[PDB]
Design a protein around this ligand. Structure first.
Ligand SMILES: CCOc1noc2cc(OCCC3CCN(c4ccc(C)nn4)CC3)ccc12
Ligand SMILES: CCOc1noc2cc(OCCC3CCN(c4ccc(C)nn4)CC3)ccc12
Lengths: 36, 251, 177, 280, 280, 36, 251
């Protein structure tokens, strides 16, 4: 199914690996376009 | 109701004594879907010029014959458009209708097992570090006879042990494979339809044989007749055959 | 040409009227030569391979120089094409040099299985081969030879999986503090 | 309602036997033709007068998940630790196969194709050859095809920057971890009817190449001679398989090949001879 | 709906390939100018007749978090324990760098600036040089810039009144702890194009000065000669990075400097030579 | 009575043994029937 | 807007100086309909494996070159799947995109006429009762050069008179045929798309050539350049190609 997650610690850094959020480019590497 | 007529190409087959027919693994052949696909080019689907009955060179069944086998797509290597389509592309996929034919008289007795087995990886003839050579698993339409003779290049040969299914497994458990029996008192033809089966959407027609057709007589052919020797003939028709990644012709 | 900048360009000749090969490349991406490139080095950090590759070519010759080249990807299960006919029977782009220096062609992901190995070693992904569709034509008093540059990137198609350590870098000694 | 029904192990049930009566008819269910390739349809009640019996029996245990879901040994790696500057040697390398130990190999080779996640469990044991042992720590690193293969107890690759490694030290309990189904295709091939690009190496050799399991003793040069034997165990989790094949009839010769023949030994099945067929 | 979609590892998806048709037009998508500094926009469907394929593949594993989020060795500290009144010596000191071990160094040096929390994991191993070991306890203290640096196994600074120390003793499992991103600026510098106030020490030397990791054996004078080798491992958690750079092409010489040149050795890339370019 | 189960991990494969679902043949081994 | 990109197979062609393109007789190629058909078997339509750009052996244009021609389907005899499909069936039909390519410098001048002419029945070289021999109208991809030499078997040869369009008709009325001009100062490519055209729904790919491509330079190639000799290259792609009446392969 799905899975369970709680943070057991008082500080940000103790927390485990972060969640993923979309690539959402912008194309700034491949097309940084001054007139598009 | 013991009649069968199967029409495939411009080809139509007929048999007046058959036992039903079997559809391998309960699935009829189909073209490869968008969900399952891998190769992103448009497949080529020759339709009637490809999916039609190709009938190979016949073999002779005698008091001494202990078995035979063929490999697919290999046996069709030189057959028509299916053949040519085979070496012009990297990849192809197909299902087949296999129709094995042997007739006799009400005065003969004999029994064949006709099995279509997937990924039939046969065994080397000798002990130690041998393997089987490409040429020996790619006989073309002629297939392998089980011969008691000594052979050309033995470290490369496959076992002749047919009752071991050639694979080191007991014949007679050979059933969990799609199969029929041709038993002369009862039938005349065997018929098997198979779907593509492989752990990949399309594979190489050249370097990989999806199926092996193996017929070994489990009941020896006995007669008082003048004709004490009869032919078995294989005809197989590809079905929903498609190819992709076209390039020049491999030799 | 190894440790120069000339390793990065190929040279075309007006001296040749012919269906001659210019160069060829293994198409697998962790392969040589392309392993050194961005997309290669990164692919070299994973064990699995899939997508389509974008090969773009820039013609660096005189503004007045012209040629037409054939760019061809010949899919696997066959040998690197030895002749123009043999090559052209595969997936290709005929490129005409003119006002725009550049052209991009693509090797489609065409493969048995959904993914491939970044270090296949025996198996190939196919080849990409460059030929003369016509000839490199020149006016009076302009350099007889012109260069050609070659680029790769991945398409929207492209993906890597199963992270592994890279094979393109090592540590022999110890590193100074 | 499925936390309960599987706690007493009852989902997947066997049919009841119904009562049956004297038959007189033109319908002959006992009579079929096995030539069709079809197994007969006859049931007890068809050929004999049967009583009603309510069958409580269960197929749960017979499921593919139950059968493959037990771990068994797939490899035994012995590390004989030398002290000849200690760094030139003292590492395992193993190319990864389900094919080198017969018991689990026979089971999965019941099917043509199989698919599943894997649970690897380790059982390391230190055989002490000196007066004592001291502190032994071990490292096991998975080195997929193409990753740099360690050539010495020494080399950088045990840095394991992106590779997965697991550590064991004496007194720690048996390491374990899970793998996701790793093939490049939709399933693993238990058998392969084809060769490589070069038309060589018939069989499974071609298909599943997982790379290698590499072992090293990590504790630095010391005085005790020991041997470390880490046995590798493998459970299948989350399983499907397709196309059942007949079970291996003969001893296994070689991995990745079906070769059965052995030198100067009669070819010997598990069938057992009788004096005569009219006596059991 | 994101406890589920990431359990089978499917957030972040790859586009499908659409069907494509014979094109005849004045629109030449294959034709661009790479002089612009822009990478081409062409897709398979633009230059070839393609079929529809539904792409199930996933970029999750390619995320910055997946790539940096594996621990690898950044330092190896050997403590050779002497007994010459035992208190004058027997401590590590290490100035803290991601720069002394090549494998992780190459990875982070893929970017110009990086930011993240750190998970340090320790793998101590006692090499026994006497008949036995006894009870070895170790102390590891983080000594930030300006904190008093221990000069002897002895000195007061191991009191660790406000510093962070972690203790290990033989038989205890691998210590671990987390660090919050420690720079004084918004990100760590992987490269620095500038010098110090004194116009000296080009490079990273200037930027990230974390102070030092100090090790001491805490068990009091005893009879067994041993060596303790504690290897330091580092995972990045919670990561962002900016400005990708090309990957290091050559072996690493020195920390905090890009120097590649080596004495009496040809300068050697990972590129591999061919006989001729018309053959692959 | 019944029993408690949670998944503690982020990845599919970590999860324990799967649940059983019915044989639901179809008879494709025993009767793959072209005319039934 | 002088750019063109045509994609056919797995093949894509590009030209940065072209003059429009011409569609022969104003009709785009199509598959053969139910109303017009004759042969009652299901045609085979190889799609991408067949309708793709095949490019033939190039020819050299010099100060002396007075013309060349090729015949279709003939030129494609040995090309890939289209070729093989050609001899495995009695009948086939196809349209083509013809793309003729010749480039030069702004410092050269020359002009080619590129014409695709239907049923181009050429004329015998000599007087009296001669005809032209099968082999001479079926050159394959190499085509006919107009050569001033004496030739092998002259009673079987076709005329070398190109300004007579080889047919006994005035060149320069050669226009009522679908055509373009390649004129070096202006363009670089010529492009022609043609539909099947014939008084029958499908014909024999072997014994009948529907089209002839003929390019003869009406303006002689002049330059002060070092390269005083340049190649012309023909690439043609079949379109909506279908075959029927399959049998074995004619040689
Ligand atoms: C840092 C730990 O690394 C490892 N230690 O032990 C390990 C064991 C591993 O393999 C997992 C099970 C696999 C074995 C491969 N296998 C196949 C595949 C094809 C065939 C024909 N036969 N067997 C399928 C499942 C993977 C990694 C490690
Ligand atoms: C009582 C335990 O104390 C410690 N033991 O081991 C430790 C390790 C520690 O560093 C954490 C990771 C840091 C290393 C510094 N680093 C950089 C910074 C700049 C550059 C250019 N390259 N690398 C960024 C991240 C901190 C404390 C301890």
């Amino acid at each position: 199914l799905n899975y369970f997650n709680i943070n057991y610690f008082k500080d940000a850094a103790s927390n485990g690996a972060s969640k993923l959020e979309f690539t959402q480019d912008p194309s700034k590497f491949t097309d940084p376009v001054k007139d598009v | 109701d013991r009649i069968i007529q199967i029409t495939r190409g411009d080809s139509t087959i007929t048999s007046q004594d058959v036992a039903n027919a079997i559809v391998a693994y309960g699935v009829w052949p189909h073209y490869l879907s968008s969900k399952d696909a891998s190769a992103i080019d448009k497949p080529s689907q020759p339709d009637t010029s490809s999916n039609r009955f190709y009938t190979l060179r016949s073999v002779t069944w005698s008091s001494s014959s202990k078995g035979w086998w063929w490999k697919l797509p290999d046996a069709l290597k030189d057959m028509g458009i299916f053949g040519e389509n085979m070496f012009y592309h990297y990849l192809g996929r197909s299902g087949y209708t296999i129709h094995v034919q042997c007739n006799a008289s009400k005065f003969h007795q004999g029994t064949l097992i006709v099995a279509l087995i997937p990924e039939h990886q046969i065994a080397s003839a000798l002990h130690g570090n041998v393997n089987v050579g490409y040429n020996y698993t790619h006989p073309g339409e002629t297939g392998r006879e089980v011969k008691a003779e000594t052979r050309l290049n033995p470290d490369l040969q496959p076992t002749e042990e047919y009752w071991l299914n050639f694979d080191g497994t007991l014949l007679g458990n050979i059933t969990i494979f799609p199969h029929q029996f041709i038993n002369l008192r009862s039938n005349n033809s065997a018929t098997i339809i198979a779907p593509y089966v492989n752990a990949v959407p399309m594979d190489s027609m050249r370097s990989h044989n999806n199926w092996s057709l193996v017929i070994i007589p489990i009941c020896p052919l006995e007669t008082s007749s003048a004709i004490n020797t009869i032919p078995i003939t294989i005809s197989i028709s590809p079905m929903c055959a498609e190819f992709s990644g076209a390039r020049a012709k491999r030799q | 040409y190894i440790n120069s900048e000339n390793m990065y360009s190929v040279v075309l000749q007006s001296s040749i009227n012919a269906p001659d090969k210019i160069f060829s490349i293994r198409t697998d991406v962790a392969s040589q030569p392309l392993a050194t490139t961005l997309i290669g080095e990164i692919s070299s950090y994973f064990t699995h391979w899939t997508g389509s590759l974008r090969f773009s070519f820039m013609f660096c010759g005189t503004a007045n120089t012209t040629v037409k080249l054939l760019l061809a990807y010949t899919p696997p299960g066959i040998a690197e094409p030895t002749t123009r006919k043999d090559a052209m029977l595969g997936t290709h782009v005929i490129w005409d040099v003119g006002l725009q220096s550049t052209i991009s062609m693509v090797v489609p992901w065409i493969s048995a299985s959904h993914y491939r190995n970044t270090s296949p070693g025996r198996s190939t992904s196919g080849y990409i081969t460059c030929w003369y569709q016509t000839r490199l034509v020149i006016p009076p008093q302009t350099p007889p030879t012109a260069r050609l540059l070659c680029f790769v990137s991945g398409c929207k198609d492209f993906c890597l999986r199963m992270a592994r350590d890279t094979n393109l870098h090592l540590q022999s000694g110890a590193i100074a503090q | 309602e499925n936390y309960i029904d599987e706690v007493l192990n009852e989902v997947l049930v066997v049919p009841n036997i119904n009562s049956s009566n004297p038959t007189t008819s033109n319908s002959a269910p006992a009579l079929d033709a096995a030539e069709t390739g079809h197994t007969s349809s006859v049931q007890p009640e068809d050929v004999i007068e049967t009583r009603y019996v309510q069958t409580s029996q269960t197929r749960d245990e017979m499921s593919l998940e139950s059968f493959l879901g037990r771990s068994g040994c797939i490899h035994e790696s012995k590390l004989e630790v030398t002290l000849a500057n200690y760094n030139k040697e003292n590492f395992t390398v193993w190319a990864i196969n389900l094919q080198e130990m017969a018991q689990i190999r026979r089971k999965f080779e019941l099917f043509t194709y199989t698919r599943f996640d894997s649970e690897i469990t380790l059982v390391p044991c230190i055989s002490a050859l000196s007066q004592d042992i001291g502190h032994i720590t071990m490292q096991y690193m998975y080195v997929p095809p193409g990753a740099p293969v360690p050539n010495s107890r020494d080399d950088y690759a045990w840095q394991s920057g992106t590779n997965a490694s697991v550590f064991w030290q004496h007194g720690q309990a048996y390491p374990r971890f899970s793998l996701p189904f790793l093939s490049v295709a939709s399933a693993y091939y238990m058998f392969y009817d084809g060769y490589d690009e070069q038309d060589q190496n018939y069989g499974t050799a071609n298909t599943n190449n997982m790379g290698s399991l590499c072992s090293r003793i990590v504790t630095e040069k010391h005085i005790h001679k020991v041997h470390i034997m880490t046995r590798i165990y493998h459970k299948a989790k989350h399983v499907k398989a397709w196309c059942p094949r007949p079970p291996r009839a003969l001893e296994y010769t070689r991995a990745h090949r079906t070769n059965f023949k052995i030198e100067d030994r009669s070819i010997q099945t598990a069938i057992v001879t009788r004096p005569i067929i009219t006596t059991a």
